Amino acid sequence: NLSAKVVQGSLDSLPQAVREFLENNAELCQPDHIHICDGSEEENGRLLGQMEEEGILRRLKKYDNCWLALTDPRDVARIESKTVIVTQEQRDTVPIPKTGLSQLGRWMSEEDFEKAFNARFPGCMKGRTMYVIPFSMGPLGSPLSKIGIELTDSPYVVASMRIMTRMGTPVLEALGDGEFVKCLHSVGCPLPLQKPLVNNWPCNPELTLIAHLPDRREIISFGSGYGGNSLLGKKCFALRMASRLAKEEGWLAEHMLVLGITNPEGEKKYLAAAFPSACGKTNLAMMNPSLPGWKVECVGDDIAWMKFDAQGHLRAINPENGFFGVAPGTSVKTNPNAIKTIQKNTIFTNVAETSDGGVYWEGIDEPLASGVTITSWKNKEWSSEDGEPCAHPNSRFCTPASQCPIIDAAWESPEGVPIEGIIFGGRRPAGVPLVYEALSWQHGVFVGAAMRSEAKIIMHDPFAMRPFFGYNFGKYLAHWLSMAQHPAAKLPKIFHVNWFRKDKEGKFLWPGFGENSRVLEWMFNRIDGSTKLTPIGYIPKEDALNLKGLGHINMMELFSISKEFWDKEVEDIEKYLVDQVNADLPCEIEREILALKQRISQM
């Protein structure tokens, strides 16, 4: 029966639970074949070649083993509207807002979900192969890591998973008869194709739905092939589901990069930072610092799982195995370590391709040689005069973390790394100083809770988690607050930064990139215990910030704090938190709102 559709590996080789899971969805999705992924280079080579044949991937000959996927323009990014969490009670997923609709997540009834499921998955994989992906989120074999099993009908998803996680036979070895997260994905285009196929990229935008069923330890994704919607260990699992798990077990799951910074005296600290959309998450994570004698090393650029250790140190681990980085804006100047990481074994999605088989995108800042032309991401010849970018703004590179030249020696340490500083941020063209320090852990929690960022629209993005909350944000805030009561906790110092303050002409006041190291320097020394008090927190006092080697900086305007602006700021924050979190807003947050309001009143 089933055994006969297996084209790689052995049913009997799977632990019973894994097998039962496979049997159930195979019988449900009706795939022509079953491929049990082993994660070997050989298998990867096979899948890539096939992908080349079917025209799903193109080979980029300028580089060593680099590929390019072009998608249907209708499937290029996460769709928040189509992203849901399924629980018995709405309250458990999102707070009931005072007005309008929740901006803190999208909830769906068990009932509505069954209907939506039944309308999508039966026979969804016919004419296609169902791949079985065993994967570990976090270092392989660590008892603190979580294992998942993802069923997919997309070889692109497979090849990407091989990079973004530990994947294959060794993962199954470690799982044994242990529990796992059930992950079901399907591009939603059974053969024969009922609709036209674009760029050989199967997707079903109409019926696109990314679901999470925490009580069942299940993730169910339909209709999109885009990474955030299909790499189930990443957002769906390592952020959403995990934040819920963690909330139940004392730890934390955050949208945070993790970096290790060393001063000229050899002292080293690890910092974590939560930044929204652009904001240069990856640029900070693998920054080449401008300050002589300093050293920045990368642990992770997207996700952090943190748990207090026996001495009360917040330990962070990167459960990812690679970087799913935004490509436009990436250059030698802005992120030299990133350029180097991707010279090899990397999958690019939706970038442009030079005629010598290289890659290209806005802000690559790499002049073309005589006679090199550009094929844009829509497979058309391209010039600067066409009025559309050569690469999609959300285009991606998918690269092994082990290739980053400054990958931290402890990025896979099962013990994790001790966080001494948490950094919040956003793109605020006006009003918010370059860097400020929270006055207390409670105030710091409020700072993260107050996060806003210019997507020309400025939106709220609490802890940079707006699209990723796995449960009630009100409760998420309480959990964070409770940390100040954990026995002998060594709470990280909390800062808020802004690299995007503009002058009236809209020109940046701060150069950024390598120079942010200067800000990092200030944070580092503060952790070691100086400040100028302001209503919003501590800023660097005069001449404390290291400006040696910089052109001129308008420090006066960069750190300017206006009552007019901050009046409207706390006003907007209060309204947002009270309306959106409503009955679930922790009173400690209420106190910080009022306290900030008070402090602003005496200026």
Ligand SMILES: [Mn+2]
């Ligand atoms: Mn992210």
